[PDB]
Ligand binder design. Structure first.
Ligand SMILES: C[As](C)(=O)[O-]
Ligand SMILES: C[As](C)(=O)[O-]
Ligand SMILES: [Cl-]
Ligand SMILES: [Mn+2]
Ligand SMILES: [Mn+2]
Ligand SMILES: [Zn+2]
Ligand SMILES: [Zn+2]
Ligand SMILES: [Zn+2]
Ligand SMILES: [Zn+2]
Lengths: 260, 260
């Protein structure tokens, strides 16, 4: 398996997921289709599938066009608002990309139709990948536009959180630095935050993406993934993960980003 | 002048403003009219005037019924939505209640037609009074249902804020304890807040209203009146009173009240 990170718009990431065995590939959130087709040509792969994390235009807005550029494409998504949708899927739906196995995980909150795609190589020895759209970011999470703190708690801790720790996290946007500046405010004594921020500033400095991260890593520095930790709860002044989730999300929403 | 505080509903306050000379009186926000009538009868005074701070039902909801219980009433307000008006007033409108002088102050924000009433007796042998409805509370302010942070800033610091410091503040509700618990969170090092909170808790215990406060006191413990203070701005992460106002109000809107 190969995952090529493709920057789009201002801070979006599209992901070309390649099956080495068959050369078949899937494209996650193809908002800039010519860019997808170029990457597909560059890697010599055959694009057969579109995996849409949610209906927000910055993620699904290129589906109509890509389908006119490439025939035969199967467009997956868990929301009728997604353009050019061909295969409406739900929690635990599965599909294959060549030899790769894709498991659809419903993570409603950011949007009610949000789907994260867990991709693995059956029998393989390579770590799997999870495409988390605007549900889980590196050190952050999406705003709760169509959902509650309870829903995000379930998405992050019970659905994504139970995937293997070595799962690579490929999220919707390049928000890592700001996410970590917020994480640093929530837990000033947490060194994993501070070192991941040093690392992200350096990547930013040289024009390289901060994805992927791993789930084990998110449990060390992402305040939303750490709503069960006593340090995060005490910062919020709560004693359960759902109310801590609600408080930390509201806090992040009004947080003024420091310049360093 | 004599101001009789009259509790109504669950935490509302109506105010019978008595001119001890002519034995004439005005009533502020007469939501429970029969209660008003008994009060006027207990104090041997003739009700002549109704002063309405704003159209919300818990303030203006008894106007039509009061006019039906009492004839010849003059009913003032600065908003067409107020029932039973006889006189529509605006910023700086003046009127008299017996020997008392009344000055209308427009404080749009909570509602667009909100009016605060400044009452004084000529040849100041006693402190004036300001009836602030849902604009200024003891240690708090009203939600910005029909206006902006700029508007509340003006209403509080420039329109009310510039009245004599000894002016008594008679607000629409008994929200003092909760207001100060939020204030304490904004400024944990402010002794005036913790002292007023302890006092408010005791007044609540013996069934005594926390009104009136004075404008001078409000400047020592009300976060909304203190948006020019470095401590409040630091809490909000801002450096100007208007953005501080916006941030502090948004925060209070979603603040979880602690048990003590
Ligand atoms: C803030 As969005 C439009 O990337 O869900
Ligand atoms: C919350 As209200 C109805 O007293 O403006
Ligand atoms: Cl805060
Ligand atoms: Mn904070
Ligand atoms: Mn706060
Ligand atoms: Zn989105
Ligand atoms: Zn997005
Ligand atoms: Zn009101
Ligand atoms: Zn009210």
């Amino acid at each position: 398996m190969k995952v090529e990170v493709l920057p789009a718009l201002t801070d979006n990431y599209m992901y070309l997921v390649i099956d080495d065995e068959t050369k078949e590939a899937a494209i996650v959130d193809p908002v800039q289709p010519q860019k997808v087709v170029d990457a597909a040509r560059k890697h010599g792969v055959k694009l057969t599938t579109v995996l849409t994390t949610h209906h927000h235009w910055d993620h699904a807005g290129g589906n109509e066009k890509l389908v006119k550029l490439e025939s035969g494409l199967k467009v997956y998504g868990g929301d009728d608002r997604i353009g050019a949708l061909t295969h409406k899927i739900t929690h635990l739906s599965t599909l294959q990309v060549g030899s790769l196995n894709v498991k659809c995980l419903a993570t409603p909150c950011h949007t009610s139709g949000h789907i994260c795609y867990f991709v693995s190589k059956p029998g393989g020895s390579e770590p799997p990948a999870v495409f988390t759209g605007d549900t889980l970011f590196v050190a952050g999470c999406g705003k709760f536009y169509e959902g509650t703190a309870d829903e995000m708690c379930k998405a992050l801790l019970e659905v994504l959180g139970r995937l293997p720790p070595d799962t690579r996290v490929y999220c919707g946007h390049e928000y890592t630095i700001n996410n970590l500046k917020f994480a640093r405010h929530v837990e000033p004594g947490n060194a994993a935050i501070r070192e991941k921020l040093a690392w992200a500033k350096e990547k930013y400095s040289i024009g390289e993406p901060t994805v992927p991260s791993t789930l084990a890593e998110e449990f060390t520095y992402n305040p939303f993934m750490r709503v069960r930790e006593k340090t995060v709860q005490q910062h919020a002044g709560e004693t359960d993960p759902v109310t801590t989730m609600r408080a930390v999300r509201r806090e992040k929403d009004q947080f003024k980003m420091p310049r360093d």
